[PDB]
Coordinates of C-alpha atoms in Angstrom, one line a residue:
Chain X
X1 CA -3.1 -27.5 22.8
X2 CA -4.2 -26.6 19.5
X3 CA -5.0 -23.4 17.5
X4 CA -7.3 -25.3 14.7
X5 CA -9.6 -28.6 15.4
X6 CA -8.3 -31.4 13.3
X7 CA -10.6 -33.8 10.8
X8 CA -11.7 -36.9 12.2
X9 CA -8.4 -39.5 11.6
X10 CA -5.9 -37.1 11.0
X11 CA -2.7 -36.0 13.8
X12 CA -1.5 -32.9 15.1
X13 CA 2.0 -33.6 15.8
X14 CA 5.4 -31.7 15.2
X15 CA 8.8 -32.4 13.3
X16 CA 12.3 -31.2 13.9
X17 CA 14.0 -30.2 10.4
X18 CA 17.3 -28.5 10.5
X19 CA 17.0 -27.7 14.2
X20 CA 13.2 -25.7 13.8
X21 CA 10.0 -27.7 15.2
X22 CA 7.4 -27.5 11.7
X23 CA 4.2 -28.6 13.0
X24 CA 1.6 -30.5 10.2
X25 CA -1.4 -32.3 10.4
X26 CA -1.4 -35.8 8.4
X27 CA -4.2 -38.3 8.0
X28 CA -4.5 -41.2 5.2
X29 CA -2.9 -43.7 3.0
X30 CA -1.1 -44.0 -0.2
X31 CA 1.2 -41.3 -2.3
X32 CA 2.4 -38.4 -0.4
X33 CA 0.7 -35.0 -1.0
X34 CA 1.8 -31.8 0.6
X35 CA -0.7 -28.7 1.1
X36 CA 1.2 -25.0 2.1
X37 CA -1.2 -22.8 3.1
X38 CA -0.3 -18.6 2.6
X39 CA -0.6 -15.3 4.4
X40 CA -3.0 -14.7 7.0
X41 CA -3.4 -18.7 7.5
X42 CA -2.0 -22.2 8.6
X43 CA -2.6 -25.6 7.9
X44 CA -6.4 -25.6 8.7
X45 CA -7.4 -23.7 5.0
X46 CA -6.9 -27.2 3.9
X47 CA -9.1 -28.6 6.3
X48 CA -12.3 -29.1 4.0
X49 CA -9.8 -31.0 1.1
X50 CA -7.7 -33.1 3.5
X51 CA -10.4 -35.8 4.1
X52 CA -11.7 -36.2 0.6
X53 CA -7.9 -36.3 -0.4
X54 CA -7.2 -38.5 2.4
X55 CA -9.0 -41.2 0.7
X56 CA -6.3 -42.3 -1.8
X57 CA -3.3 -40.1 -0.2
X58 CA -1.1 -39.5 2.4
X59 CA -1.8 -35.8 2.9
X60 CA 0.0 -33.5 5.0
X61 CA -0.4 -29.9 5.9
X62 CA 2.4 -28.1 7.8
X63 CA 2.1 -24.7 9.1
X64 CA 5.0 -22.1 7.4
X65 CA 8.0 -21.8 9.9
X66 CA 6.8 -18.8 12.5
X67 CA 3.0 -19.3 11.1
X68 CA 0.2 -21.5 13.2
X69 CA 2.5 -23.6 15.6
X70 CA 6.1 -24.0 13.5
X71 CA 9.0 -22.2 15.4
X72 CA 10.5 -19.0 13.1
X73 CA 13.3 -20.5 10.6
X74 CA 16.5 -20.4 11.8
X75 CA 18.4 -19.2 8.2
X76 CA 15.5 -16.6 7.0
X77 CA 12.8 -16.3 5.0
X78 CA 13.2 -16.3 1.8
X79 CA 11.7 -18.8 -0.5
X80 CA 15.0 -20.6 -1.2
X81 CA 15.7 -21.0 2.8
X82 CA 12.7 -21.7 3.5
X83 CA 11.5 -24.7 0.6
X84 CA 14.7 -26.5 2.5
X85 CA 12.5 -27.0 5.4
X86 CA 9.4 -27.5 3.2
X87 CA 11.4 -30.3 1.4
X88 CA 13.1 -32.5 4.0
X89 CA 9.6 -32.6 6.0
X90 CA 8.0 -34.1 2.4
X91 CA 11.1 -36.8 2.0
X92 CA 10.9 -37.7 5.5
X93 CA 7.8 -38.6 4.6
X94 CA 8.2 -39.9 1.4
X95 CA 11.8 -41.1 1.0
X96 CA 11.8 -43.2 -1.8
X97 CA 9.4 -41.8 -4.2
X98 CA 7.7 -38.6 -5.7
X99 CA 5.0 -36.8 -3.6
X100 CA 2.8 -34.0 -5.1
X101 CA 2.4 -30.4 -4.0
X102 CA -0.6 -27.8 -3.5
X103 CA 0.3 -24.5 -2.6
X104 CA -1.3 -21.4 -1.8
X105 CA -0.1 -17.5 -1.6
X106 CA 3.2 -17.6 0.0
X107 CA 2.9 -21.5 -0.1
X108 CA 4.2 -20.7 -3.7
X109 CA 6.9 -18.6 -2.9
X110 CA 8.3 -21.1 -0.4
X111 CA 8.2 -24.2 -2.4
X112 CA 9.0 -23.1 -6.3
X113 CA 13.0 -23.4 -5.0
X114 CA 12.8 -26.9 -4.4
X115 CA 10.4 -27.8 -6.8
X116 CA 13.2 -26.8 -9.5
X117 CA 15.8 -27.7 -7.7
X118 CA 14.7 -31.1 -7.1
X119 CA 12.2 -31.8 -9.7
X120 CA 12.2 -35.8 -9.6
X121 CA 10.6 -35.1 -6.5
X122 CA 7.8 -33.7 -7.1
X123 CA 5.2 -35.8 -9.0
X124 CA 2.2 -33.7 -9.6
X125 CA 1.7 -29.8 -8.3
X126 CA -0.9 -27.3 -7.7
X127 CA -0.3 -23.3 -7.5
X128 CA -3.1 -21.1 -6.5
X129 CA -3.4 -17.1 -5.7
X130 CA -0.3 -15.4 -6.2
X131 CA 3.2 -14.5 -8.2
X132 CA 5.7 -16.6 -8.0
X133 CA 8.6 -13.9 -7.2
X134 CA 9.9 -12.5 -10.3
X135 CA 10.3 -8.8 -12.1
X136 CA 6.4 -9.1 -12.8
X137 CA 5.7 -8.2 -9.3
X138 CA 6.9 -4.6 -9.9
X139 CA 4.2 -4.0 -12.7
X140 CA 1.6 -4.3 -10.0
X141 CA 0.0 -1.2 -9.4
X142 CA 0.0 1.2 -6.5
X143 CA -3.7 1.9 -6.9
X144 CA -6.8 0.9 -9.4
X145 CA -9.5 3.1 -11.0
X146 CA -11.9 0.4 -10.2
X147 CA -11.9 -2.3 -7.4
X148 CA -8.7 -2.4 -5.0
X149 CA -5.2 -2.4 -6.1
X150 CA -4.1 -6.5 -4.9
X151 CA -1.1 -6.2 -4.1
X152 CA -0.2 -2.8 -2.7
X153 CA 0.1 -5.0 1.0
X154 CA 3.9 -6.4 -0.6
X155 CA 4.9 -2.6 0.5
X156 CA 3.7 -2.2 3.8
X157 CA 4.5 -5.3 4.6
X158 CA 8.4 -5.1 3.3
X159 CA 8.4 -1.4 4.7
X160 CA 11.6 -0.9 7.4
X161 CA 11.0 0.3 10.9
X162 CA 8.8 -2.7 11.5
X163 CA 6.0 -0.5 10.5
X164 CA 3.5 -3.6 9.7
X165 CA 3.8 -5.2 13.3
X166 CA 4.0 -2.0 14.9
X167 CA 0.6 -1.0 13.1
X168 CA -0.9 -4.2 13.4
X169 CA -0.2 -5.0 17.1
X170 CA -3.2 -4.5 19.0
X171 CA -5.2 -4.6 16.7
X172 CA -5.2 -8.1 14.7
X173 CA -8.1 -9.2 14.6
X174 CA -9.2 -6.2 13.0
X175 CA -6.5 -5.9 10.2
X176 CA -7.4 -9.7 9.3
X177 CA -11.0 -9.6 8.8
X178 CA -10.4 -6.4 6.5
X179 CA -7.7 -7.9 4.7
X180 CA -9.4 -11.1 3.5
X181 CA -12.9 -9.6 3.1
X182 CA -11.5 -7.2 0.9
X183 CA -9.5 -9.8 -1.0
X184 CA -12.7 -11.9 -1.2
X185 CA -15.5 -12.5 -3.4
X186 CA -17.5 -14.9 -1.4
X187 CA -17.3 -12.3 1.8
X188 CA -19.7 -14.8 4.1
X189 CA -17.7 -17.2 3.9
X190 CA -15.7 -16.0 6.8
X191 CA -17.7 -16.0 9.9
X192 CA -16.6 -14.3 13.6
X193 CA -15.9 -17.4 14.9
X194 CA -13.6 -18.3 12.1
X195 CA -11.5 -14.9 11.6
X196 CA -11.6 -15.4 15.8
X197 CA -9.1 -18.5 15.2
X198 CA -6.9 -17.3 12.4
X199 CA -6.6 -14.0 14.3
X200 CA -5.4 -15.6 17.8
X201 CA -2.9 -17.7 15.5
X202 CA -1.1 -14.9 13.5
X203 CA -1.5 -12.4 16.9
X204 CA 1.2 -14.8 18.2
X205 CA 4.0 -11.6 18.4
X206 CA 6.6 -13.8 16.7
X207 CA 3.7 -15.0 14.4
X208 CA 2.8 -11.5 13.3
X209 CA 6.4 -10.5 12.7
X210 CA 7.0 -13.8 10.8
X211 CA 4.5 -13.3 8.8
X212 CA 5.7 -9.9 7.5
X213 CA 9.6 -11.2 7.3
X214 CA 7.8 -13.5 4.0
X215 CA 7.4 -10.3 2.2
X216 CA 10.8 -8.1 3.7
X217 CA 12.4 -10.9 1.4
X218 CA 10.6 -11.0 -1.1
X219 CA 13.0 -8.5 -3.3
X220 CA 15.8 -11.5 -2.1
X221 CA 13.0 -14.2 -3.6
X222 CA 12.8 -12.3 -6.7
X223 CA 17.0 -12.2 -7.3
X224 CA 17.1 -16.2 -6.3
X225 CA 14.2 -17.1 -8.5
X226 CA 16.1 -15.0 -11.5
X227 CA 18.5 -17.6 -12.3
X228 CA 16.6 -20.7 -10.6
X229 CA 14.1 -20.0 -13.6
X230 CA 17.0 -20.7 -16.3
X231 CA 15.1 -24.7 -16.1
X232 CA 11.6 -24.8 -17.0
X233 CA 9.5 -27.1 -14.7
X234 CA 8.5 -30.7 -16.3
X235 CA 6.0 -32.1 -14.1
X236 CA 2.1 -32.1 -14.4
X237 CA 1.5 -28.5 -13.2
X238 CA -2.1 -27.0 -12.7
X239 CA -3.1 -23.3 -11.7
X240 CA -6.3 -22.1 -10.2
X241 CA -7.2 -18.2 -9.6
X242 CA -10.3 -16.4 -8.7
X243 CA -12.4 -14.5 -11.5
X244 CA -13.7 -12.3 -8.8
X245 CA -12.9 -9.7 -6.5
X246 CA -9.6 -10.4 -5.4
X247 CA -8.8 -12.7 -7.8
X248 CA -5.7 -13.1 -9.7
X249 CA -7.8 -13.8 -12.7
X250 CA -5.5 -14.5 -16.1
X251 CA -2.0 -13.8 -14.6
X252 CA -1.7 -16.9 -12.8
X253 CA -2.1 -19.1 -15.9
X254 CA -0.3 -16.8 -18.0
X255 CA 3.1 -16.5 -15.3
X256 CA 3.0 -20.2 -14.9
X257 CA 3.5 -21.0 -18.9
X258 CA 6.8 -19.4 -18.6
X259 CA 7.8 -21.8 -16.2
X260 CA 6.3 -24.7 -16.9
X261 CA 6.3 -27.1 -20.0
X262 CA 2.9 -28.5 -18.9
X263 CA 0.1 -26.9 -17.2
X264 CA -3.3 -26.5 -17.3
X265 CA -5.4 -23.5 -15.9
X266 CA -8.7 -22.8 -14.0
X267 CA -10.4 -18.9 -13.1
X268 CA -13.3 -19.6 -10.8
X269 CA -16.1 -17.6 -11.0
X270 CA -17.6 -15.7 -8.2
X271 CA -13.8 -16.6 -6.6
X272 CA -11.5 -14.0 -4.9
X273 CA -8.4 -15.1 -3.2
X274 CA -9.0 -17.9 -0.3
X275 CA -10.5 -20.4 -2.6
X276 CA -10.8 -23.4 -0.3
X277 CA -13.4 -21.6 1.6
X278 CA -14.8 -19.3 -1.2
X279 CA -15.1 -21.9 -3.5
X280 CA -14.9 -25.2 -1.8
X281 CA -16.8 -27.5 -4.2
X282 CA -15.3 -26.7 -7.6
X283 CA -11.7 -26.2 -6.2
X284 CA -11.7 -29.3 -4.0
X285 CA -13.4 -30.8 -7.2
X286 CA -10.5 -29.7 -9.5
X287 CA -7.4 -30.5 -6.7
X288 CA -8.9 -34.0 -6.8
X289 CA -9.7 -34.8 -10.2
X290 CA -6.2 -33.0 -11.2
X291 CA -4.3 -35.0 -8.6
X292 CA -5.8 -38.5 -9.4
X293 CA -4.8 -38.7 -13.4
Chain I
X1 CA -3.4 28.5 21.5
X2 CA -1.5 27.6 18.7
X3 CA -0.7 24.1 17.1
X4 CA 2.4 25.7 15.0
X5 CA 4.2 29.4 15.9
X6 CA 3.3 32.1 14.0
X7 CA 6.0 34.4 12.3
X8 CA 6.9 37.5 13.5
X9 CA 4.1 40.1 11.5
X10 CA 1.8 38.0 10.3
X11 CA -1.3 37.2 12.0
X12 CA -3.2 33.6 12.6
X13 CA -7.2 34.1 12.1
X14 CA -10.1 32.6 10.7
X15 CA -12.7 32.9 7.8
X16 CA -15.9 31.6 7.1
X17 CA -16.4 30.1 3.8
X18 CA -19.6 28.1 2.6
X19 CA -20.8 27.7 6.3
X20 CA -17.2 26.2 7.3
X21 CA -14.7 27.8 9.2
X22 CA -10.9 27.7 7.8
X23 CA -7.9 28.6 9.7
X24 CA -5.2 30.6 7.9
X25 CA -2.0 32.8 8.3
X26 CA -1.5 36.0 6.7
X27 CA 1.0 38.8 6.4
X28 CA 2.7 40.8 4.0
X29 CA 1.6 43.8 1.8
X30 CA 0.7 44.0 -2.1
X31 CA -1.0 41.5 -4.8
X32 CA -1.9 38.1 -2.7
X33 CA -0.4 34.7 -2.9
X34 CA -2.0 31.8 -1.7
X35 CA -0.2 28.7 -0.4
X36 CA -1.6 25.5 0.2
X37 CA 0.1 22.5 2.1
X38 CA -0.6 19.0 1.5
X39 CA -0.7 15.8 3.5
X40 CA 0.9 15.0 6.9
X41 CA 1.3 19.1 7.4
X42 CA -0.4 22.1 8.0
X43 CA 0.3 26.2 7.2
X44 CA 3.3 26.0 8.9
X45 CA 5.4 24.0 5.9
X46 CA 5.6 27.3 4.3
X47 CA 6.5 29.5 7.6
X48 CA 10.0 29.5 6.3
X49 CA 8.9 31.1 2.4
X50 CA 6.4 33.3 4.1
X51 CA 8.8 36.6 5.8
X52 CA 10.5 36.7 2.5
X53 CA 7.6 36.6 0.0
X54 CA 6.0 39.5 2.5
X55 CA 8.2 41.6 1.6
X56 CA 6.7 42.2 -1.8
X57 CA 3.2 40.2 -1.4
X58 CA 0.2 39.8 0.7
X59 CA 0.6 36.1 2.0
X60 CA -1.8 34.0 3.2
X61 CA -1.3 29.8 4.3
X62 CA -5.1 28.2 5.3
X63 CA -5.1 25.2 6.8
X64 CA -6.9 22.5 4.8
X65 CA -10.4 21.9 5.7
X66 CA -10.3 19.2 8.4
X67 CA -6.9 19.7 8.5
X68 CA -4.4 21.9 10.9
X69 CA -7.1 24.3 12.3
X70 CA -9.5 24.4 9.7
X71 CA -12.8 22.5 10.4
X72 CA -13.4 19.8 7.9
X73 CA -15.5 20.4 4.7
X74 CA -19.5 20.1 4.9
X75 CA -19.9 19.2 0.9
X76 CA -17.5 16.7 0.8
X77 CA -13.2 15.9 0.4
X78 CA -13.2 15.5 -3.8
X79 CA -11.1 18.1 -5.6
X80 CA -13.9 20.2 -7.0
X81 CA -15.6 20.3 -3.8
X82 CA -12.7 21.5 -1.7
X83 CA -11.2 23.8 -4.4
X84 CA -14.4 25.8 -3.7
X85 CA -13.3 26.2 0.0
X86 CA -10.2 27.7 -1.0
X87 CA -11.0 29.9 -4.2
X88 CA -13.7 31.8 -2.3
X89 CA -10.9 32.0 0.7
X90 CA -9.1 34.0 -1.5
X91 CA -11.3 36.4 -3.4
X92 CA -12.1 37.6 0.1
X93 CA -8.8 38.9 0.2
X94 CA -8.4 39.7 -3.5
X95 CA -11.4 40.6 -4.7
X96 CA -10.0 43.4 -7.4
X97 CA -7.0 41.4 -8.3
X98 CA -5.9 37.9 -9.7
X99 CA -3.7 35.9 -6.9
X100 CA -1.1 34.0 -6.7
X101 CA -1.0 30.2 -6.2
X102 CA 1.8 27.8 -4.7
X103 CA 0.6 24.5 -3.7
X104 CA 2.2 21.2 -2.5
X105 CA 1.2 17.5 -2.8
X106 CA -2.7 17.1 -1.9
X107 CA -2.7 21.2 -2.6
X108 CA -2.6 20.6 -5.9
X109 CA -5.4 18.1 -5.9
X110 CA -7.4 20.8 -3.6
X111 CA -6.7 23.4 -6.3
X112 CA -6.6 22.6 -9.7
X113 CA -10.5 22.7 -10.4
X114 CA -10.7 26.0 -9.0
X115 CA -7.6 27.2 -11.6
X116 CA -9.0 25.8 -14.7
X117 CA -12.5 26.9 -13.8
X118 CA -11.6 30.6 -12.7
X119 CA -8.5 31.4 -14.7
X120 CA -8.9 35.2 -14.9
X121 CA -8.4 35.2 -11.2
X122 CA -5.0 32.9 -11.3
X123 CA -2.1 35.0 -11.8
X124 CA 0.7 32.7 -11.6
X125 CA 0.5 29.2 -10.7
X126 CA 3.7 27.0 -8.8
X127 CA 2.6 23.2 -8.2
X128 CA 5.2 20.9 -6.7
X129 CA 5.6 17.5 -5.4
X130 CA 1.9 15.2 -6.4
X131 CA 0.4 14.4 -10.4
X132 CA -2.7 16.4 -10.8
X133 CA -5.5 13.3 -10.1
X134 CA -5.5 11.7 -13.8
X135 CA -5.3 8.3 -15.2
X136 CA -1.2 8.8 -14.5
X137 CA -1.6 7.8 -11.2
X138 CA -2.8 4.2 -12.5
X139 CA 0.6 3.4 -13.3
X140 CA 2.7 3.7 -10.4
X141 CA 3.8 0.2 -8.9
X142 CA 3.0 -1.2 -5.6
X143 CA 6.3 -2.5 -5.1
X144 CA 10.2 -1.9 -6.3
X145 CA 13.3 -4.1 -6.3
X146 CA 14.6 -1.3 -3.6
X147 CA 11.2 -2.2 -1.4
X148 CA 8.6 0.0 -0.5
X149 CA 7.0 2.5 -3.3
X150 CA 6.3 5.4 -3.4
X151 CA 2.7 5.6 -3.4
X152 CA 1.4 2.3 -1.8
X153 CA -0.2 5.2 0.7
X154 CA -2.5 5.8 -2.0
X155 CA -4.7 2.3 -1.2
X156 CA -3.6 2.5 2.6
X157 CA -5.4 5.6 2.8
X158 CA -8.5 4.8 0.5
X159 CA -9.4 2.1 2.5
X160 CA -12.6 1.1 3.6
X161 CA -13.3 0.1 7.0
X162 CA -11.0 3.0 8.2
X163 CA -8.8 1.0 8.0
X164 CA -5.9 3.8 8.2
X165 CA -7.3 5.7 11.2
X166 CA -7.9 2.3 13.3
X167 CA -4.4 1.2 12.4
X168 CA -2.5 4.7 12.8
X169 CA -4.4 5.7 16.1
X170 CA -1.9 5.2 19.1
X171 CA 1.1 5.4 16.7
X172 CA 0.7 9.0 15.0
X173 CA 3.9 10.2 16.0
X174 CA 5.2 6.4 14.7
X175 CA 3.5 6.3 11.8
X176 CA 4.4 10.2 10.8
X177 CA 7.8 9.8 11.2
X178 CA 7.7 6.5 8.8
X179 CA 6.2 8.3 6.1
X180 CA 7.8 11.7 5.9
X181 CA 11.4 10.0 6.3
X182 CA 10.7 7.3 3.8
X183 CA 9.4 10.0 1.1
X184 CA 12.6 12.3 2.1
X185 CA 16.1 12.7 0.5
X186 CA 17.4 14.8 3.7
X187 CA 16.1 13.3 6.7
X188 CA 18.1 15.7 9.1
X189 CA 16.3 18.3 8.1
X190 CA 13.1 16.9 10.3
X191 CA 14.0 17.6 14.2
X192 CA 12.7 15.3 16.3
X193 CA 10.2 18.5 17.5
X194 CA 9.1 19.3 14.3
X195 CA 7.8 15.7 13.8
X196 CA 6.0 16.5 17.7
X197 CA 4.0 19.4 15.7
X198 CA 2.8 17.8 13.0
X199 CA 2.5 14.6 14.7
X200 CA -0.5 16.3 17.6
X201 CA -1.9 18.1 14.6
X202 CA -2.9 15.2 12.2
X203 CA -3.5 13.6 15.5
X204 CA -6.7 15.2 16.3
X205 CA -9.6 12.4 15.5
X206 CA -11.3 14.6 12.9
X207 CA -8.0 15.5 11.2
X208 CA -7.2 12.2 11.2
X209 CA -10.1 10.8 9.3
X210 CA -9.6 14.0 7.2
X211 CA -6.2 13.2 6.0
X212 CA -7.6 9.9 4.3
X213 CA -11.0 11.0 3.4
X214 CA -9.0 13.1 0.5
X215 CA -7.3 9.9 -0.7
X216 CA -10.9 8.3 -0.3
X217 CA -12.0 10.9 -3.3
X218 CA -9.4 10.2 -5.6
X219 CA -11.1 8.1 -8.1
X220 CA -14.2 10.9 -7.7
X221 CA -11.0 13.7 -8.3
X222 CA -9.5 12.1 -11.4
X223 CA -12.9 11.2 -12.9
X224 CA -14.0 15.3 -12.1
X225 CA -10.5 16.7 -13.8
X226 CA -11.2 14.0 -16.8
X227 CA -13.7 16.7 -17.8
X228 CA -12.1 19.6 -16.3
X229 CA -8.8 18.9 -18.4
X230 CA -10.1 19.9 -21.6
X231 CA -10.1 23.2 -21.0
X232 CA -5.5 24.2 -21.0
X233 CA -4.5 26.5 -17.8
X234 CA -3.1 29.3 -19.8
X235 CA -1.7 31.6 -17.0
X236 CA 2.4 31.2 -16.0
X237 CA 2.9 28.2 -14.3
X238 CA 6.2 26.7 -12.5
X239 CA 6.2 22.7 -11.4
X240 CA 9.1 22.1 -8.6
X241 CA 10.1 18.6 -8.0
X242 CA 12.5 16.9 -6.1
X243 CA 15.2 14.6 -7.7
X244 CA 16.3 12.3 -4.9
X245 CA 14.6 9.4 -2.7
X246 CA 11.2 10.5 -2.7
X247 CA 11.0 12.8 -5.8
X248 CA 8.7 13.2 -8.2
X249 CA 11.6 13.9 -11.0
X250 CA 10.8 14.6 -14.2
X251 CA 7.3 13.5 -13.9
X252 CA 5.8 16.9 -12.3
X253 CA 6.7 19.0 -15.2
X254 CA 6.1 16.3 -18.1
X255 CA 2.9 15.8 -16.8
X256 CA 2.2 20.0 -16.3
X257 CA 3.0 20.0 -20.1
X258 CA -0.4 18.4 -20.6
X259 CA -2.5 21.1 -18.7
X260 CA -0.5 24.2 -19.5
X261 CA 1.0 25.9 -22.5
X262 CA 3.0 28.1 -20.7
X263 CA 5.4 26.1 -18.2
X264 CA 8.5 25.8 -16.7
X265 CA 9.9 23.0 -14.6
X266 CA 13.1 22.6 -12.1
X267 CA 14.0 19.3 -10.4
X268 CA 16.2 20.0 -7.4
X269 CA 19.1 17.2 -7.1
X270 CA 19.1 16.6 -3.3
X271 CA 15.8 16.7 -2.1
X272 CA 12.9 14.0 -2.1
X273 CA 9.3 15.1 -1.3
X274 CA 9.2 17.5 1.4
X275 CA 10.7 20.6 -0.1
X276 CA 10.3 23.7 1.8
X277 CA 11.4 21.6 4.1
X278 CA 14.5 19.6 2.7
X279 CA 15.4 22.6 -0.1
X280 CA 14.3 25.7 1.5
X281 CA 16.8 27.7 0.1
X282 CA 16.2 26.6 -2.7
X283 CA 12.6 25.8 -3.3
X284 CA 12.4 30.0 -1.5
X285 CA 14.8 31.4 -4.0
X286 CA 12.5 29.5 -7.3
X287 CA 9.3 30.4 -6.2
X288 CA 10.0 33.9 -5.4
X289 CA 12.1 34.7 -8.6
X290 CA 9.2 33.0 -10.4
X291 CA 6.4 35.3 -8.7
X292 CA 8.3 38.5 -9.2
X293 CA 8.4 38.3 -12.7

């Protein structure tokens, strides 16, 4: 049984790390390369990229412990407890040699940790569409004179009381099409039939709630990430954000340079947030070209 | 019947204004004072205040339109538009005489454009607990180190789609309860009943949808009082603010120093938001002092 159809020659199938079942998909050959999807997702956001990637690479695509079909994590959910799961699924993978990363939204927030930490593992990476956790996140605003404010979800999502899940149950599949069409540029992108299958997915009860525990330690993210960021990252790093509606626009390039002794930087045009489906073309086009230097 | 009870000598009636009909209560003898209630609440936030300033005042507490038992606006939720509502409320009780004004939160949004544009008939002025719509609001963050801010609402309730009215239906009481606890100091203070009252109030659909549709003006509010502004409020005025959890602190008067040359300010340690409620004593003992100058 499966929430997303998989690409022609890839797997569905599930591994145990550190007692919690992390489902992926992985097709191809070669070098290792990870995709983490974000909030409001799984594994299948990736699903355009993974067969031209799949062409020189291993790729793999797990779903975030609670998200798509991976059980909840058993320590929590911040992005240092979490990037141990992210981690050991990679080097089971890839054992004996460097694999690259691409990461989206909260993919970023769980895999920064073991990126630093372990940084002779990680040959080449890819950040798209959000913060990493750091003091910058409280500069955000509340609300905008023009537009929407981005980010004023990190608060009702952290809120106590389960208020997110409590709001939210019942009424999924509603919340989601709002939430990415108002974080979109490229609105038509996202058709019934595809909000239908990322709604049944994060309408999973323990998939709703797991999504919000991502942000209720984010605050915990932010204090971990304070002294992780004393060692500036080495590797080949490249950023992409939208340039439109919903788009991070300068920020993510500008973040990254403070952690990061090499990286490159792309704002897409037309672009909100979900740029694999927004923006297919140039950002598959930039992933590819970025990863086979 | 009644949605909140009604003090002993004062008297629950109604008034057409503009073609829309506004609930109010009233009691008391002398000059009037007028005092308007904000969001989540109704009249009755000031049903403590109101026996004592009747025994030197006329009194009177509407319900905003759309709100509590007034029917909702027919021009529209913006601060210019609705501060017509209520000026004309009170000159048919004052015509000979300049009035009074106390307002709270989205009061003072509701009422400032009537002040500046009619000052002769303003004789004192108390404003506590919201900024007067300006470009100060821009700053507030979406998101602390401590979790949830203080004005995330701000974009909850602006949203398209109604996006707050499909979420809160079913949960009023929930939801309610959230908000007023998280912007309090002193929680006790709120019975579980007194959350039932305003909880069925807000609850009707149309005073539902008119809770938000005043956050859904703003932008149109702060762009109005951009021009408004540059004409000072010259008459007496008092800001009140709370200087716990939920507080404005020293924000209320520092920003009243902008508008007003002739101000005075009190931040009550203690108490967050809610302040007739959390600080009656208090908040009473201030605002009557103040008025019987």
């Amino acid at each position: 049984a499966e929430e997303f159809p998989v690409p022609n020659g890839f797997e569905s199938a599930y591994r145990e790390v550190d007692g919690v079942k992390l489902h992926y998909v992985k097709g191809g050959q070669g070098p290792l390369v990870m995709l983490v999807h974000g909030f409001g997702q799984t594994w299948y956001e990736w699903h355009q990229l993974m067969p031209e990637l799949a062409k020189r690479f291993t790729v793999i695509a797990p779903d975030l412990p609670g998200l798509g079909q991976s059980e909840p994590p058993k320590t929590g959910y911040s992005g240092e407890q979490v990037a141990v799961y992210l981690h050991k699924l990679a080097r089971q993978f890839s054992p004996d040699r460097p694999f690259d990363l691409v990461a989206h939204d909260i993919g970023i927030w769980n895999t920064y940790p073991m990126v630093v930490k372990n940084q002779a593992d990680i040959a080449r990476l890819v950040y798209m569409q959000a913060p990493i956790p750091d003091a910058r996140i409280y500069r955000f605003p509340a609300f905008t004179a023009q537009g929407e404010s981005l980010v004023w979800h990190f608060s009702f999502f952290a809120a106590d009381d389960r208020l997110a899940e409590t709001l939210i149950a019942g009424k999924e599949r509603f919340f989601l099409e709002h939430f990415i069409k108002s974080h979109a540029s490229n609105t038509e992108v996202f058709s019934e039939r595809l909000l239908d299958l990322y709604a049944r997915s994060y309408a999973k009860p323990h998939s709703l709630n797991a999504s919000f525990e991502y942000y209720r330690a984010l605050n915990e993210s932010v204090r971990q990430n304070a002294e992780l960021a004393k060692t500036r990252l080495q590797m080949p790093t490249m950023t992409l954000a939208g340039g439109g509606h919903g788009g991070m626009g300068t920020f993510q390039l500008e973040q990254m340079k403070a952690y990061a002794e090499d990286v490159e930087g792309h704002v897409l045009p037309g672009c909100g947030h979900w740029l694999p489906e927004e923006c297919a073309a140039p950002m598959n086009r930039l992933v590819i070209d970025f990863l086979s230097r």
